[PDB]
């Protein structure tokens, strides 16, 4: 067995037909569209051709789970979160075999080899999608994310979303107190769109908020299940329809169920989106991911820092020689405008 080199790595990484690489999550596609790759270790938001981005965000320091605000500052220089999730390749697992496709290769050591190697470079890259997507969500529908990774201290990042921005339904009208029979959900929808200072044209809901806006006749009645890839919003659907649906439009809104999951440390299950909130936006608001230097020393020696990904593959010597394929990435979402965001909870 030899360790594939990392020209070998990039030729599948960049290969053009393979889903977990070409397309990201639902908030990353519709509102972190862009990548910025830099070559410093640090994001270094100032430098930014585009002007229509973010250029600073108030980073606080943290003790625990405390956000130490009197230390925090305005800065445009943010230290991303270093990713270098790894896997051990071990060819005595049982290959699954695709939906045509070739049994003969499947005996082959070095086919086998490749097949876990790159199975585990798209689980690698799903992980940090995940991650990036969670910031995504974070940012925003609290203005918030909280950073962690190799060789930094845990601090917050602070868009500073208005407060309006953030709207509980408990500290006014509550949907679930509603007459189904009579009332129009729309005037409350126009109601927290207000808060944009923009046009809205989409709404992403979770489960809950889709279940309780369609108990609505009135609703239903308003309901325009019809679509047909004539938005930006449904476009970035089509390729998610195992965490994301599509149901049409309210007027110029386009609507979105979004169920999508990750699971933590702990391995649970968790929602990006809340069940019960609704996130009110403009496709048009489209920043970026900004990904930081990588930092590995063999990334460093052969001048491969300014990259998205870094993916390497090694084998160590021991009484078992245990193989292993790890990426290296430092993604940051940055948003273009966190005030043409408005964030529901649904009661």
Same mark, same amino acid.
């Given at each position: 067995?030899?360790?594939?080199?990392?020209?070998?790595? %990039?030729?599948?990484?960049?290969?053009?037909?393979?889903?977990?690489?070409? %397309?990201?999550?639902?908030?990353?596609?519709?509102? %972190?569209?862009?990548?910025?790759?830099?070559?410093?270790?640090? &994001?270094?938001?100032?430098? +930014?051709?585009?002007?229509?981005?973010?250029?600073?965000?108030?980073? =606080?320091?943290?003790?625990?789970?405390?956000?130490?605000?009197?230390?925090?500052?305005?800065?445009?220089?943010?230290?991303? !979160?270093?990713?270098?999730?790894?896997?051990?390749?071990? #060819?005595?697992?049982? &290959?699954?075999?695709?939906?045509?496709?070739?049994?003969?290769?499947?005996?082959? #050591?070095?086919?086998?080899?490749?097949?876990?190697?790159? !199975?585990?470079?798209?689980?690698?890259?799903?992980?940090?999608?995940?991650?990036?997507?969670?910031?995504?969500?974070?940012?925003?529908?609290?203005?918030?994310?909280?950073?962690?990774?190799?060789? &930094?201290?845990?601090?917050?990042?602070?868009?500073?979303?208005?407060?309006?921005?953030? &709207?509980?339904?408990?500290?006014?009208?509550?949907?679930?107190?509603?007459?189904? $029979?009579?009332?129009?959900?729309?005037?409350?929808?126009?109601?927290?769109?207000?808060?944009? !200072?923009?046009?809205?044209?989409?709404?992403?809901?979770?489960?809950?908020?889709?279940?309780?806006?369609?108990?609505?006749?009135?609703?239903?009645?308003?309901?325009?299940? =019809?679509? !047909? =890839?004539?938005?930006?919003?449904?476009?970035?659907?089509?390729?998610?329809? $195992?965490?994301?649906?599509?149901?049409?439009? +309210?007027? /110029?809104?386009? +609507?979105?169920?979004?169920?999508?999951?990750?699971?933590?440390?702990?391995?649970?299950?968790?929602?990006?989106? $809340?069940?019960?909130?609704?996130?009110?936006?403009?496709?048009?608001?489209?920043? +970026?991911?900004?990904?930081?230097?990588?930092? /590995?020393?063999?990334?460093?020696?052969?001048?491969?820092?300014?990259?998205?990904?870094?993916?390497?593959?090694?084998? $160590?010597?021991?009484? #078992?020689?245990?193989?292993?394929?790890?990426?290296?990435?430092?993604?940051?979402?940055?948003?273009?405008?966190?005030?043409?965001?408005?964030?529901?909870?649904?009661?």
């Amino acid at each position: 067995a030899m360790a594939l080199n990392t020209n070998q790595l %990039f030729a599948y990484l960049n290969r053009g037909d393979i889903a977990e690489f070409k %397309f990201s999550p639902l908030f990353t596609t519709l509102f %972190f569209p862009n990548v910025a790759t830099f070559s410093t270790q640090n &994001i270094m938001l100032d430098t +930014l051709d585009i002007e229509e981005v973010t250029m600073s965000a108030f980073c =606080s320091p943290m003790v625990g789970s405390q956000v130490q605000r009197d230390k925090g500052y305005e800065t445009s220089t943010i230290k991303p !979160g270093y990713m270098k999730p790894k896997h051990e390749i071990d #060819p005595t697992k049982t &290959i699954m075999r695709m939906a045509g496709e070739d049994p003969a290769q499947l005996n082959d #050591p070095t086919y086998r080899r490749m097949r876990l190697i790159t !199975g585990n470079m798209r689980r690698q890259i799903n992980a940090i999608k995940a991650r990036v997507e969670w910031l995504a969500v974070n940012a925003v529908t609290t203005g918030k994310n909280i950073i962690e990774g190799e060789g &930094i201290e845990r601090y917050e990042i602070d868009w500073k979303i208005p407060e309006k921005n953030i &709207i509980e339904q408990a500290d006014g009208k509550k949907w679930s107190e509603q007459d189904k $029979e009579t009332h129009y959900p729309i005037y409350d929808i126009e109601l927290y769109a207000d808060q944009a !200072g923009c046009p809205a044209n989409v709404m992403i809901m979770g489960a809950e908020v889709w279940r309780t806006l369609r108990s609505f006749k009135k609703f239903r009645e308003l309901y325009d299940l =019809s679509r !047909g =890839s004539e938005s930006a919003a449904e476009l970035a659907c089509k390729n998610l329809g $195992e965490v994301v649906s599509f149901k049409g439009y +309210l007027g /110029d809104l386009a +609507l979105i169920v979004y169920s999508g999951k990750y699971t933590d440390s702990d391995g649970t299950e968790k929602y990006f989106l $809340e069940p019960d909130l609704l996130v009110l936006g403009n496709t048009n608001n489209k920043g +970026l991911v900004a990904y930081g230097a990588i930092m /590995d020393q063999e990334a460093v020696r052969t001048g491969a820092t300014q990259n998205m990904f870094y993916p390497k593959n090694w084998i $160590e010597d021991g009484d #078992p020689a245990i193989e292993y394929v790890q990426t290296h990435s430092a993604p940051q979402p940055v948003p273009a405008d966190i005030r043409k965001f408005v964030t529901v909870k649904i009661a």
